[PDB]
Symmetry: D2
Subunit: 363 residues, 4 copies
Amino acid sequence: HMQKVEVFRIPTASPDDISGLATLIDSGKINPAEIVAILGKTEGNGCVNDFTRGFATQSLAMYLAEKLGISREEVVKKVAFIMSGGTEGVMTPHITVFVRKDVAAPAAPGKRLAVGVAFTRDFLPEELGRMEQVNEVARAVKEAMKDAQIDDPRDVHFVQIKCPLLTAERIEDAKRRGKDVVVNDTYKSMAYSRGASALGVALALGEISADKISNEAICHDWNLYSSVASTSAGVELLNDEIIVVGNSTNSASDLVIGHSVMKDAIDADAVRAALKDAGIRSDDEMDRIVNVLAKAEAASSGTVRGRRNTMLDDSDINHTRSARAVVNAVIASVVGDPMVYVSGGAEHQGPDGGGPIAVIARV
Amino acid sequence: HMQKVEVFRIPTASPDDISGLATLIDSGKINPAEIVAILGKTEGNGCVNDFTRGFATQSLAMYLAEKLGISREEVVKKVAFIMSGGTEGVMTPHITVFVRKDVAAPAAPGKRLAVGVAFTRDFLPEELGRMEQVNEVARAVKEAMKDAQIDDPRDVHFVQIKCPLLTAERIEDAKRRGKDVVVNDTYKSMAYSRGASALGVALALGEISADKISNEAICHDWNLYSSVASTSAGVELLNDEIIVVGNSTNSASDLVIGHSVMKDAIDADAVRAALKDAGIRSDDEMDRIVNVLAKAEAASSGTVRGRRNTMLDDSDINHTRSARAVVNAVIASVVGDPMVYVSGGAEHQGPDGGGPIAVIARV
Amino acid sequence: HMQKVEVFRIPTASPDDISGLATLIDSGKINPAEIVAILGKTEGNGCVNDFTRGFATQSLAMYLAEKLGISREEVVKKVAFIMSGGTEGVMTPHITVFVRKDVAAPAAPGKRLAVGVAFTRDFLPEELGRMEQVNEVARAVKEAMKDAQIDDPRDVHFVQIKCPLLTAERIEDAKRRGKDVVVNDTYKSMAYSRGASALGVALALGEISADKISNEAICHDWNLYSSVASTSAGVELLNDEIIVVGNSTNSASDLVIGHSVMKDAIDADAVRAALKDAGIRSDDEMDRIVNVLAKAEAASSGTVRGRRNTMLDDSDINHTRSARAVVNAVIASVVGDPMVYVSGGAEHQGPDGGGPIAVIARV
Amino acid sequence: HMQKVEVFRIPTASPDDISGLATLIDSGKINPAEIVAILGKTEGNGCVNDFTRGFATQSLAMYLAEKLGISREEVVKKVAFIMSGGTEGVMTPHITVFVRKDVAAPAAPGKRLAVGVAFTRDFLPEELGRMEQVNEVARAVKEAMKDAQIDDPRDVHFVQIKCPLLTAERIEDAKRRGKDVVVNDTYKSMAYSRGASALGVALALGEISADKISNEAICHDWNLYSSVASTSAGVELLNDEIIVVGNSTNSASDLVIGHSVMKDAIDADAVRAALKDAGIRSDDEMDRIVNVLAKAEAASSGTVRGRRNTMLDDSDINHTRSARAVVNAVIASVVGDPMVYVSGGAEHQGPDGGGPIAVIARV
Ligand SMILES: O=C(O)CC(=O)CC(=O)O
Ligand SMILES: O=C(O)CC(=O)CC(=O)O
Ligand SMILES: O=C(O)CC(=O)CC(=O)O
Ligand SMILES: [Ca+2]
Ligand SMILES: [Ca+2]
Ligand SMILES: [Ca+2]
Ligand SMILES: [Ca+2]
């Protein structure tokens, strides 16, 4: 007996739309008890005051609890709900449902898709963006690796994380308790939480050594980055949820995952490199895409290939919204489909101005 | 007579930045008296309350007036200043300077780049988005065609237009004169002005017959569109400025212009088709690009290739900003350069959700 | 027979925050079976893509269903949920819970607070913003009056309404059945739905005669308006929910409601007039305020007291957001409390650029 | 000889609108050679990418240069141009023209309006938000104080300052020279620049002693604040421009200035205190207002009088824009006129969440 991971990319009409998942359950294509993780793009602003993330999670947990005959708390304690807000540009709201079954297939020669889930403890507000978050996330990434039955960190192609943020109220509550936070800015606290979580991935997978990580390097030393980490902050949770996605020889999945790294926001070559790494070597094989998952960010230099842009200066549109619109459009122009996962703010995720990109594809 | 058109794509540090144009004049590469048109991307929001367009026009007219020893009003009567606001995503602020001289070189056995300029009369607020603007623009397009020495409408590849819009103050002005405007929404009035101007192009070039155009069809009948029209609305002007760009046998330019039409916002094939129509058939020949000029818009269906997006539903970001970020990113991923011209809102400019795209290239 | 209305203004930490309402129920101060209506301010953008309204309604319906031992569908059929998004400026998110019980005490001398609730039938897309909605709302307002036991329309001080809007699917469905909608714009359909609902109130209360109302007058004739109507649009419902709030001789409530009409967005005199109409005649008595409820809008003239503003020209901030922030600030400067209900878009609710304002106060 | 200060509040139709000033000059009521300072509200977003400030300054300097027969550079060396962007809510765009004459008019009984102007040297990027800017501003405030013929710092009621900010290019320059900037964020650099300049005012006027000011206290110790300072950041200048406004015994002005300090954003009592300090003691005498000038900010506590708001959490609308809309709305409700000067970001200007407010009134 081995594991078989099935992945379903489901378009949504609204944050609370569960009809697509319900159709796959009522037809028997998805056993709801075998759902291990759901990764969504919700049509909020994707920043601090984005409540479509919790709206989407509450609706899915409410639906799965009534189908499984259990409580909502038991659902959210077992299944990872990672909602990335912000569907700018042509990016299509959707959810990606990860299902894991235990089938009895012979050990075929080769690595197939594997998935592992792990949660961290709740963090205090004054712990975000600091080593407490880095070390706790690294421990959970190793836990999710064994949950996915993956030994070689080279076989990990994507580590999706949902992490907390700071609000004005939580920063006030920390000041009243005599504590200091990593940054006094709610929007900027999302970057520190994403960066600390990303460095935790690189630490766990051996991508960077521990003697290089410190509080002063977080969101400062852009030479330190993971090539597979993908982290997203949200007001709706106080801990970190980790989804490790890779390939294992002890897998009966009809899917594989490959990945690459975009050097900048318009790096279309990395998109095709990630497709080839997933077994898709031509445009005619593009129908085997299950989903594309990528990180996007505005370069700290304020330029792309020596060309100035205003993402860091635009006070009307936060730069994470612009980055999502840009990279999603780039990926959409390559694969012919805008319904792909793009998350903004790639601190320590790929180089400065770039980010990891993975492709889940049929075989 | 023998015309030679030279085109300079100049990066800008701010809306009022004239240093790049001043350097090209002081080096002798540009005779300021031969400048006929300037097409700019300014880093305002590109909608109603975008004053970077007028800031850039005033700065350029003031500089050219002092260099030429003439008044600012004589400059704006002679040189077309078309400032398209909105540099979203990775799009780089810049201006494109068109210089036309009468050289004594033989007509190479082929059509080369030609440019023609024409202005319309000022419109009253109640004329925007109606037949008065359509017929007046149609006349100016023919006027600019003979300025470009282009007889066959088949040889016209891009018609850039700057047209007015409605503000709350101008709508009140029309009411106090007993007149009603085409729409009581300032942002939506830009669409009516862009569409009426675009229909004037299609009428002048024989793309649609006049018996099919009417007030009720403007911004309603999306079957009527020009394949080369590119219109941009602005608060800083009260008339329409026309720039006809094509190829003519009476041209000694070392440049040509080709074009295609994007069927939707992610139509990368149309970008490559426009490149091939301009003589670039491989990635290695892409260094011959002078500039790429394209229209972008949110499709009225709210979808791209059957995939929903929120451009028409996002009350925080107007859909013309989203469309500019998307199509510029797509073009940038193809040509490797985000410093290209993309204008949003393509009413009657290409199909619904698409727009014409032209490339000016060296030979 | 005898009614007692209790009103609780509860601050919320997020759209899904039910802790304040839960504390009042667990302490025994609120019997959840006696809740008849909940009027909330949710911290979404208050425009088209505001999902905090459904998020807040879903959370309250989910919580009350488990406390009452009934289904969520039965809760929304029993309790009126009117969620007004947009808490701009200093406006404090909160909910206002209306409790109506049947006590066995005689009606104290004078008229005391009375509340009545009624729902309309579901509307087809082609009926919104037209006479079908006006007459249907008018019927329900008259129905809710006797449910509140109010005979004299002079004793009605506030009519809060939640009304539907048009979406891309509902518009396309109407043309599929050979019908045309009042407007092809989702945001503008919210204004027509608010205006039609407001005209239904004025018709029911005898503020305007039926011979003056027609399809052409809806959102056109700003001389026709109600002085107590307060309407708010939302995507989460297909009918109109009506809350009539007034004073009745057959009431044992310890509260009363008075009201006035703001002639413009900065009409502080109207705020003080509404306070005295509710029995508060000095600054020292402001602690008797339970809540202040007001409508806000941008004047169609684009001016306030002869002074231009940019609300109708600002493409970065929707004008309904600006209007809510202004009137909330004006009320807060008078009562010393920014936690008051202010709803935007006051079509036929007060004069053009103004709106009704009511005060619920202790006696 | 004796000085006479005349102040003109002029409504504007656009950032580049000089028609109101031209009417007062063409009528002979204003001698353009006697203009010493112009304080404007321009309808840009009032944050980083607000180019209406430079647009207004360029348009006004260009106009006054042609009227005076001198160069534009000589005008900006002579006249203070302080353009504060952001006209949110109902706030009316306008400019305030300060004219100073040497008349032979009797010394009115009392101290009357006096104005003084002074400029600092240009600051290097590493000097913004630090003691170099504080000490340099303090000297210029003393220079403008004696320029206004004001001896007692108690007679200074308003010190308006325009200060620079940091851009990506200026940060690289400081980095290339081996220097570090106070903060690596363009938007937050406006706060540090505003705070350092404000502390320079308090230092110059003796409001706080020098031993309390340091680099670590800037934008941290909110107990240190000036009660008359009003600072505004802009990209269009590299130094600080200071306008000292007060009352002097050596003045023949028909005007006086009083002031108060708003304790929070809704402190209407402070508005009335500023009116009475300026000699306006009843509602009928508010027609003597020339202009009201105030600072606004979002309190770092995220609350107003114990009531939560979303200004520090709103990722769609910058909190300085919200603060301007609120405080302008509050002042408008008191004086009945939205055309008053309100500036956002009040670091070390009044208490945390408050700001100085001054009134210029006729006598
Ligand atoms: O993932 C991103 O695009 C940025 C983020 O952390 C917040 C979110 O997704 O809601
Ligand atoms: O009531 C308002 O403030 C505006 C509206 O109609 C939609 C909403 O409530 O979100
Ligand atoms: O003065 C303000 O309102 C805030 C600021 O510094 C930037 C500006 O003025 O544009
Ligand atoms: Ca990165
Ligand atoms: Ca089009
Ligand atoms: Ca109204
Ligand atoms: Ca302050």
